């Protein structure tokens, strides 16, 4: 509980559209304007509309053979998760990467709930705020360019698989073997100008079934 | 001496004369309680299903190296015809919840050397790794026919072609075998014992399992120290296992799966 | 997490072809040099892939006993005695059996029981010791554990000359780690 | 305790890289973008990656023979430290030298802990914040261009040498004689635009073994 | 079983798995009392000196006959550099009083045959017998480098030339080895044990010893039954010993001896 109860960089978000506009899923140099809340690798998978949980990590550059990776994850969690399942609440922190006054709207969607990527129902309003889903709105020179909040565990699963899920998620076993169904804490959609880094803090963290850590090259 | 142990289960009974005791994973046993996620009264206490199912697993030769292993997906390893009434009942039920009582057997002699690690692991990848093909219903939950090498799993195994593999440093089905000893286990040291006895309770992401889509438990036999022996000693060294589903409870009766 | 540290896990010994194996060899002779030498540091490349080291890499300091488990895998007809020694630092690594047996040691005799559980006592000028280091210091390196052949492995005809002894490590009963940290990142391979 | 329980200028820091970038050790006219937390003289020593504790003070200018010095220290502590050893907690204050709106991220690394001068694991995020180490993030027109906090004594030593350490720090006695091993309160790495002055305040200050003060020229 | 024995002494520890117990010569132990013949308060309870000093003694071959032996003069056998702090303290003291706790080791196999007599004897001649030369300080108290034959000691060995030897029927350094079993001892029978454990108190012509002139105790390993084994069995059979000075007390501190 103590070890994991601290914020670690786990994702990055980017938006080029203003607050008062219709949110539209976009990608730019491996950065989407929405996030899948999970410490495990996530990214657009096979042209999915929104980021899904990945089964492996890839370099962003096709040449370098060096990081950054194109996939989003809590490196500290992936590199050190000596357990098979875990349970916890998630404290999320979202920070603007530069000092320009913030003006953003973020929508939190519970695990597996409808994304609702609909049009604005009223002119010049942030479509992400057009919901009863928990959403945050920060703007002005009185603000400090960041947002933080804590969400409860919302997955329909009792505990989440920390590394691998030896199975399929659908009845015709056609899904991507290795990924559990609804194994996340929901998603974060963002609109407004800027690039934002994301941190995860695992509250009341509980782990089950000890298992191997990621292998490290021999010195 | 105190190493002679007999264990009865239905119309079956295992016997060993070199036991080092039975290890209970998580110090828990499946008590056979019905899943609170099902309204229908479960089918349970089926004596014909609460027994030991014995099967041959593999041949151990001098060519196996440390961490080469054999995997036994559960309950799937017994979902076939040889699963008796446990199988025939399982195939006709949507959900199944149970623990496992297992004894793996392997004898050699006072002149042979080598050791195996016998352990049970939840959510242990049982998919085929000798291909970049997506695992399917009929290839994901099969008992290994050949010893699995160890190098290709330390950082996992992505189901992508060899050239992409280069930009994929880690897959969630990774298994740092240097710590496989953190899983409920026992060691089969040829100089000490010819059997290992384990038992694990029911664990899963939910109350009961839609087994047709998930093999939550995996019995794994990995060599720790390579097999050795001199000219003249018996060369055929085989590994076997007696698997017993502990107090299985079934819910969602329906027509059989094919 | 300490639970994990106490589970005996395999040490990586070097094969004649510089390959990594979980054991070392012994035969019908008594070398004037140790069969294996492990520097007592949770940083030892020797225990780099043990659960103990894997966990310790995420902590700053340790304290307490270390358990080195040796399992004889030779034939039942093979006999012999080893002298497992733990030499505290200050006068360098022990060069002879005479020097090794002048420090903490236990004689392991083969027989009915297959393994020997050896404990490296926590002998330190400081209450806690570093898990890793840039350069070795008196607070990060604590000496060596060497296993010698006291008497040659002895056996009858029809028995392979080489016996393999499995080697494992883990934290002892009074072993502890503290201060959660992130280890030097690396690229898996 | 009372005498030393007050903030005194003890260091200065400078950065020319933005918040959302990879932190890289740099020097510019004797100012690094990281600091070694110790009242004693510290500076880049023999091309060290980061500042180390010095054994002497040097003028910044090769000509003038007048201060500023190129080495960082609490002048008030150096000029008046009539004791051989000291023990205390450290209250640090970091202030931006001009009124331009601040936008900075600071990482505190405990005494002797890994500096972790790694790459960003995610695009457009401050690499210094990519840690569980205590770090601070201040930005916006609502802020007052400063940061203050208190850290506990973290050295593995029972007490710190206030002036000299008559010995070496390694077993082959090859280190710089006179400097004790891990005799500091950790380090401060900073990213974001600006020059920042640093103050130290010695909390629950305790001193041991009276010794001579720095000599003063005869009037 | 009850034959597994561990013995701690300072930072050392002996371990055996075939012990037949520890024999206490004269049923006495050195209690470490200061000699009443010295006014200066003795230096004692030096933990760094109250430990086991292990040394290789000899190689046992088929050529050794009954009663061929190896001698270990005490405290001299440990007065060298390898005597650690016991030695460095001893060399700087005029007098020393102590007992001995010893374990001699020697393993073979279930297929080897032969036995040794391990005993401690006070005032047991340790002088060189392969010469007619008078024993000297540097030749009288040395651990035998080679096995000693037995015939030349039954009636003693006079330090006189071969022709005079004819008129000298008996020398006071005689040792009727047929009765060597009357000395505190144990037997190392290859079929039974691989170790012998003995302990003797302090005995001498006086309260404490001017060790530089006298080796009051002698550890002796003699073969009783010759070593035998068939073609194929291990041929290298060696003998070792762990020697511990029991509660040594030192008097008369002075500059070291050279």
Residue numbers in the entry:
A (entry chain A), D (entry chain A): 34 to 82, 89 to 188, 191 to 260
B (entry chain C), E (entry chain C): 11 to 268
C (entry chain B): 44 to 232
Give passages from the manuscript:
Human Saffold virus 3 (SAFV-3) belongs to the species Theilovirus in the genus Cardiovirus of the family Picornaviridae. SAFVs cause diseases ranging from gastrointestinal disorders to meningitis. Cardioviruses have nonenveloped virions with an external diameter of about 30 nm. The major capsid proteins VP1 to VP3 form the capsid shell with pseudo-T=3 icosahedral symmetry whereas VP4 subunits are attached to the inner surface of the capsid.
The formation of SAFV-3 A particles can be induced by heating the virions to 42°C for 2 min. Here, we present a 10.6-Å resolution cryo-EM reconstruction of the SAFV-3 A particle and show that it is expanded 4% in diameter compared to the native virion. Capsids of SAFV-3 A particles have pores located approximately in the middle between the 5-fold and 3-fold icosahedral symmetry axes at the interface between two VP1 subunits related by a 5-fold symmetry axis and a VP3 subunit. The pores are circular in shape with a diameter of ∼15 Å. Models of the capsid protein subunits determined in the native SAFV-3 structure were fitted as rigid bodies into the native cryo-EM density map of the A particle. The formation of the pore is caused by shifts of the VP1 subunits toward the icosahedral 5-fold axis and of VP3 toward the icosahedral 3-fold axis relative to their positions in the native virus. Low values of density at the border of the pore indicate that the EF loop and C terminus of VP1 and CD, GH loops and C terminus of VP3, which are the located in the vicinity of the pore, are flexible. A difference map calculated by subtracting the electron density map of the SAFV-3 A particle from that of the native virion indicates that VP4 is missing from the A particle. SAFV-3 A particles do not contain pores at icosahedral 2-fold symmetry axes. The RNA does not form any contacts with the capsid of the A particle, unlike in the previously studied A particles of enteroviruses.
